[PDB]
Copies of this chain bind each other. A is one copy, B any other.
Amino acid sequence: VVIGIVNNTVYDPLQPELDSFKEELDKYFKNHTSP
């Protein structure tokens, strides 16, 4: 509905603030499921 709305390879604002949570979580499950 809004005019002038722009586009790029814009990441969601949701993930970069919570990178230290979800990225560490995914890395921990990947390390646990690797062997």
Residues of A within 8 A of B (CB): 14, 17-18, 20-22
* Oligomer: number of copies: 2
The 5 closest A-B pairs by CB, nearest first: A21-B22, A14-B20, A18-B18, A18-B21, A17-B18
Is the contact region of chain A dominated by helix, strand, or loop, or is it mixed?
Answer: helix
Query: In the docked arrangement, what's the CA distance between A8 and B6, Å?
Result: 40
- Residues of chain B contacted by A14 (CB below 8 angstroms): 20
- Residues of chain B contacted by A22 (CB below 8 angstroms): 21
Query: In the docked arrangement, what's the CA distance between A17 and B19, Å?
Result: 12
- Residues of chain B contacted by A21 (CB below 8 angstroms): 18, 22
Query: In the docked arrangement, what's the CA distance between A29 and B19, Å?
Result: 18
